[PDB]
Design a protein around this ligand. Structure first.
Ligand code: 7N9
Ligand code: 7N9
Lengths: 351, 13
């Protein structure tokens, strides 16, 4: 066979140890999920805007008492208007409170006021993968593989807890001071036992079953991993067009073309992740995540060493000190105004 | 041709 005796037994033992780890991780998650750390806005100084979206912004803040820096996500309750926007914000907070994994950003505080919802996270100063990727063009296959391995392990963890992530893309992956990934933005994450039906995500990363309004499962995250690996290794994603409607048509087609510099091992992995047929998509078969972890493209990956952060990273971001923002792009700095009247109190009671 | 800038997620397409 492909493995000799020694290798096969080591791999089997490794896989049983994963099961043991995930069983303990589920016990810990459920304790926090069933029985969940506030603060207030005046406890922080505003430093700089780190990113912006439709519903608000992420700000570098400095906590007055301790001097620690944090990333504060601010959501305008009055912008969180649509039904699915509201439930998603409750999902995000509850999931972040309860998870614990080396590649998932750590939530420190959450609170709300008359105008806004706030989630205060660890500040990850190395910047978004997105900007580093756009600046360099594309990552080498070894470098893309180092980042991909962290996503594979993170999804193995999340999916074992019945959590789907639903917004993988380079914009959401921060680089920490050791060059490892921190997944941020759990705005689309959800606990799902089987199917779910919300049409949400980012166009270029949507699995076909989402676009086609079919009830879907955690396999959408494995499709998205295929999109991510392709984009990291090529410099652009596999379904690439100026407008979302054109992107959707390419996704549904079942057609992917690869740069001539992609290795055959990489193309094989990607054709099995970017598989429209759910009975054939890697991550969705009888062998689960092991079809991905044991693929030839990952043959050099030491999964435990990645988890332990003992693999040398491709890139260590430069950091001049606490609160450095040099690895982030600049954004318009807009007022953060808090109304004297409570807005949307009833719809956010649970937050 | 395609989108090179940051991509916004859509909550309800
Ligand atoms: C620009 O966005 C962020 C910056 C820092 C941190 Cl820790 C979190 C976010 C949310 N993606
Ligand atoms: C485009 C954007 C980036 C790269 Cl490396 C190639 C085509």
């Amino acid at each position: 066979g492909h493995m000799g005796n020694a290798a096969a037994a080591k791999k089997g033992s490794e896989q049983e140890s994963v099961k043991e780890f995930l069983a303990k991780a589920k016990e810990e998650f459920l304790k926090k999920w069933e029985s969940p750390n506030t603060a207030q806005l005046d406890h922080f100084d505003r430093i700089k805007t780190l990113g912006t979206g439709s519903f608000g912004r992420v700000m570098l803040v400095k906590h007055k008492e301790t001097g620690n820096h944090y990333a504060m996500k601010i959501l305008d309750k009055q912008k969180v208007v649509k039904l699915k926007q509201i439930e998603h914000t409750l999902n995000e907070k509850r999931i972040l409170q309860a998870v614990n994994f080396p590649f998932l950003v750590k939530l420190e505080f959450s609170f709300k006021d008359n105008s806004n919802l706030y989630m205060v996270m660890e500040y990850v100063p190395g910047g978004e993968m997105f900007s580093h990727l756009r600046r360099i063009g594309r990552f080498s296959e070894p470098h893309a593989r180092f980042y991909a391995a962290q996503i594979v392990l993170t999804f193995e963890y999340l999916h074992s807890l019945d959590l789907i992530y639903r917004d993988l893309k380079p914009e959401n992956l921060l680089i920490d001071q050791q060059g490892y990934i921190q997944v941020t933005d759990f705005g689309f994450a959800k606990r799902v036992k089987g199917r779910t039906w919300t049409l949400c995500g980012t166009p270029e990363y949507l699995a076909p079953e989402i676009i086609l309004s079919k009830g879907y499962n955690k396999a959408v995250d494995w499709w998205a991993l295929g999109v991510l690996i392709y984009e990291m290794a090529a410099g652009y994603p596999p379904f690439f067009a100026d407008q979302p409607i054109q992107i959707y048509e390419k996704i549904v087609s079942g057609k992917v073309r690869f740069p001539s510099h992609f290795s055959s091992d990489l193309k094989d992995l990607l054709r099995n992740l970017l598989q429209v047929d759910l009975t054939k998509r890697f991550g969705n078969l009888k062998n689960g995540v092991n079809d991905i972890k044991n693929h030839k493209w990952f043959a050099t990956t030491d999964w435990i060493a990645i988890y332990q952060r003992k693999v040398e990273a491709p890139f260590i971001p430069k950091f001049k000190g606490p609160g450095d923002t040099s690895n982030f792009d600049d954004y318009e700095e807009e007022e953060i105004r808090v109304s004297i009247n409570e807005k949307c109190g009833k719809e956010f009671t649970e937050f | 041709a395609g989108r090179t800038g940051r991509r916004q997620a859509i909550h309800d397409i």
